[PDB]
Nucleic acid binder design. Sequence first.
DNA 1: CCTGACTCC
DNA 2: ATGGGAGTCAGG
Length: 579
Amino acid sequence: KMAFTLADRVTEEMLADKAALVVEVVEENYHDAPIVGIAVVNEHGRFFLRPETALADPQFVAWLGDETKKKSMFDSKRAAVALKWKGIELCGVSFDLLLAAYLLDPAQGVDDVAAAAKMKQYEAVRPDEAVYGKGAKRAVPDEPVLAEHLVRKAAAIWELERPFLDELRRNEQDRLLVELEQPLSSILAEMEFAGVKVDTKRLEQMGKELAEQLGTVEQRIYELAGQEFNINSPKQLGVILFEKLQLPVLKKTKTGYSTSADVLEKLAPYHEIVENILHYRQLGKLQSTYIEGLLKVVRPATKKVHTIFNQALTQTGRLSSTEPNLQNIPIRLEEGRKIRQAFVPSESDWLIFAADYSQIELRVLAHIAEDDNLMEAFRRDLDIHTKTAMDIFQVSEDEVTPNMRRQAKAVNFGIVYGISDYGLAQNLNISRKEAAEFIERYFESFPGVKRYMENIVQEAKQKGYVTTLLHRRRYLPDITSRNFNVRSFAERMAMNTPIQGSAADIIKKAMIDLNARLKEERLQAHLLLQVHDELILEAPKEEMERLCRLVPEVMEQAVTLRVPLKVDYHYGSTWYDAK
DNA sequence: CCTGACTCC
DNA sequence: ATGGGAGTCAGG
Ligand SMILES: Nc1ccn([C@H]2C[C@H](O)[C@@H](COP(=O)(O)OP(=O)(O)OP(=O)(O)O)O2)c(=O)n1
Ligand SMILES: Nc1ccn([C@H]2C[C@H](O)[C@@H](COP(=O)(O)OP(=O)(O)OP(=O)(O)O)O2)c(=O)n1
Ligand SMILES: [Mg+2]
């Protein structure tokens, strides 16, 4: 039973200095998406406004953009970006219920106001999907039904703010929300709306050449197989490998023979065709995802792509990137890495600038574990990825290739995060006995890491959750399970989540600090992407010198640990050349 | 619609 | 049974 005004025009009482605000965008991808309705709840009452009315009203636009007029919202980034596409600036967001719910418990997967409301037994609001429908049936409902929904969402935010803030405070997470996540949200909104420019001429030419290449590789595979088949079907491929060619079956899953890359690599001594197939599947992913998939989402008039950074999704505090994912662009193989040549500055005589934290989760672990040897390694500015490489490959520091260092990187993180002898052995294609002895020596080098991992598992059993440096939390209710697999996975989340999450806390803080410095120094430079422990910027070529000092400094000083933080940086004419 | 493939941190 | 965190794709 909820009264509200379906307003025909904006009135002064709608423009109070505190309000719950709903700016509704139904489409999952909110870039250039319709705003279908607006709701405002404040001390004076409850109001629904039509966007064509409200958004062309100069007082309402003024109010949206006035930082002293405070708004509580759910997913303020979605509203901010949708408004930027409407040419309107949103300021003064003081509470975001999505971010509040996320910090209280990321496992709730809260994706609408109703699911957040449930956390406090508030039920005077419906789920979005129940209002709009799903798939081909998704639609905006009749105005009265829409209006009531948006108003109930705003009223929920109005009533839920204090109970959420109260609980965050009890958890010592209120500052994490107000000083970190909420300011980051506005920064991500800027990055997403800016977008990254793409060289479509180059990408399309790449794609044409790649198609010819796939054809050649495909026919070679059919020749080796003695038959045509769909190489992109693990079922058909399994029949070829394990029935026609009679190769050993190393692994099965629930649907049939495994053809994972791990398995095919191990079959190379039996038939050369597995190497061709691995190459083919790489090339096919390049074409489907990083050529075709990317071209499909380029906005043609500006040649820009606009990702969405999901800030309330991952269980550790990382961001994710969708439609397109710009956090998994190829780099490890030169063939794939060339895609990066198609990511270019948005203005002429600008350049791309990239900065990456050195050995980040190993520095974080040194600090949190207080491992004397590892802490001293970072004080000696050593490279643990390179050192591990020299060992596993029996090679000098000068003969270690970037590829070797990449592999050693997975060995280091594998070991500290609980890899077994079976897994390490399968990884380095070495003897299981050899792998076990290697793990043993690793923890004899870093015994504090070992103690830390034993202890954090016990603490997680006792408390039911683990925490990061800035008080981010993950609950682990499975960790005392009688079941071995269920318990074991939970134990390994206790080992990993605090470290990966603390690293996420750090780069989030650096983005805030960096933008503040950019503004203070009046630089045109701005952030384009975050890639977990990297920041990618564009700026006039004349700003590179400054950035070379400023960016790494801000990143390195974002937090003070018991070890130095270190940042590598590069710049060039394209994302590829920023190395 | 899921599974298993390739991509990154 | 067998490091952890992610997203997109073709095939079925
Ligand atoms: N009410 C609070 C207090 C702290 N924090 C988060 C953000 C802070 O940046 C981080 C660190 O807190 P402090 O700097 O105040 O140090 P603490 O006293 O909390 O010690 P510790 O972090 O070891 O628990 O914790 C928070 O979100 N809300
Ligand atoms: N196989 C991997 C690779 C990375 N990561 C995590 C831990 C890494 O510290 C972090 C960053 O990825 P990087 O590739 O940037 O690795 P580093 O920062 O550790 O090393 P560097 O930047 O010096 O190459 O992501 C991981 O858990 N497992
Ligand atoms: Mg790094």
